[PDB]
């Protein structure tokens, strides 16, 4: 069986810039390598086969090179629609092998999250539950920390957090955070605060509402 070592595991580069990914096979694969693109939420796509042969519906920005055990894949003039995970594949054998993948992200200017907070709907309340939701949308860079306060006091339990993959138009990230309580407990408190720390501000970015 032929093993494939794909590097690096992650790459970050600027718009208009250029990146290269490498793959090394455990033995000579005689130029039978292909490269595939996996964009978030979609199925894989063929970009190149036999080391350097492009599909005709793939931009000429994409290319490939190499021989023997050592191969590379390059993208020039990076666009935000290039955001994706990339895989090599060897097919110089009856049994094929994918490389481990390279996640590509783009750099851009720092952007502060736009923060919205939402109280529980009447529909949820009437069934006995109460969830409070905060969206922290279109920020950069990706690292952010969110805390929930109820009348000032920190609540860690019952918090569900979810992050998007990088946006393929503006190269920002977004985050949802949901604090789930009971109706009973929701109705005992007044102030609900979504507090975010992000490198774009010295102190936290907060959104709150008062139940009454």
């Amino acid at each position: 069986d032929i093993q494939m070592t794909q590097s690096p595991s992650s790459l970050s580069a600027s718009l208009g810039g250029k990146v290269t990914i490498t793959c090394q096979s455990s033995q000579d694969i005689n130029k039978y390598i292909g490269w595939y693109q996996h964009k978030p939420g979609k199925g894989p796509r063929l970009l190149i086969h036999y080391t350097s042969i492009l599909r005709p519906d793939i931009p000429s920005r994409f290319s490939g090179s190499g021989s023997g055990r050592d191969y590379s894949f390059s993208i020039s003039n990076l666009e935000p629609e290039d955001t994706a995970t990339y895989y090599c594949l060897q097919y110089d054998d009856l049994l094929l092998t994918f490389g481990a993948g390279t996640k590509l992200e783009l750099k851009r200017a720092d952007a502060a999250p736009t923060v919205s907070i939402f109280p529980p709907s009447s529909e949820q309340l009437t069934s006995g539950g109460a969830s409070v939701v905060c969206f922290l949308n279109n920020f950069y860079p990706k690292d952010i920390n969110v805390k929930w306060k109820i009348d000032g006091s920190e609540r860690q339990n019952g918090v569900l957090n979810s992050e998007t993959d990088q946006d393929s138009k503006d190269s920002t990230y977004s985050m949802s955070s949901t604090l789930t309580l009971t109706k009973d407990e929701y109705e005992r408190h007044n102030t609900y605060t979504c507090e975010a720390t992000h490198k774009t501000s010295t102190s936290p970015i907060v959104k709150s509402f008062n139940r009454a």
Partner: protein, 223 residues
């Protein structure tokens, strides 16, 4: 024209089995191998195996020998993968894809050039549960306003979310579902001009096929 159409999502109990199908159209079925590929939740694509539908000939990555069995029915142009006796390690998305059979000096052009849409397989003893869908409307005014839908308490994945039946596609973020105590929760946001809501209608459309659930939830300002 060239199409590979996979069967729908499967929920499977630990220790049980399931059979996936991939219906090919738009080309000569027996001139192409059918390969299958696994996409685990975290981490990368894994090649499972190949089948030559003309003869029944197969080959597997070692790790899947004993687990997967590839067959086909030529009359219906349909490839099958039986996944036998499963655990949570087998939870994933599974693809079929085609490979040009004929030998050429510089190998095939048809190197996984077309793919099926994927079949999601979840291995779990939790019960199918429909989502509750709750509107997210603000409790302060700017030129843009952000609304939402909370899709809570469902199992198993996936669900579909759209806004105004497809029309609102710009400024939508639909967040990946998170699993907590055997139930998934997801949310979706949409941003529109504050001049346009709540003076006009914004609705989230949620589907959960495993439960036969379709909901439309109109976002109305908060009482």
């Amino acid at each position: 024209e060239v199409k590979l159409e996979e069967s729908g999502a499967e929920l499977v109990r630990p220790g049980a089995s399931v059979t996936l199908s991939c219906a090919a159209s738009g080309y000569t079925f027996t001139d192409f191998e059918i390969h299958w590929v696994k996409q685990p939740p975290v981490g990368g694509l894994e090649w499972i195996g190949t089948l030559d539908p003309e003869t029944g000939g197969t080959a597997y990555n070692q790790n899947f020998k004993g687990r997967a069995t590839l067959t086909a029915d030529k009359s219906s142009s349909t490839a099958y993968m039986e996944l036998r006796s499963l655990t949570s390690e087998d939870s994933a998305v599974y693809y079929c894809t085609r490979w040009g059979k004929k030998f050429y000096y510089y190998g095939t052009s048809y190197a996984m050039d077309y793919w099926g849409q994927g079949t999601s397989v979840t291995v779990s003893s939790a019960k199918t549960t429909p989502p509750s869908v709750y509107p997210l409307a603000p409790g302060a005014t700017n030129s843009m306003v952000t609304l939402g839908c909370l899709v809570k308490g469902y199992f198993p994945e996936p669900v579909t979310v759209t806004w105004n039946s497809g029309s609102l596609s710009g400024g939508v973020h639909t967040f990946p579902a998170v699993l907590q105590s055997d139930l998934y929760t997801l949310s979706s946001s949409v941003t529109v001009p504050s001049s346009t809501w709540p003076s006009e209608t914004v609705t989230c459309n949620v589907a959960h096929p495993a439960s036969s659930t379709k909901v439309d939830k109109k976002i109305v300002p908060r009482d």
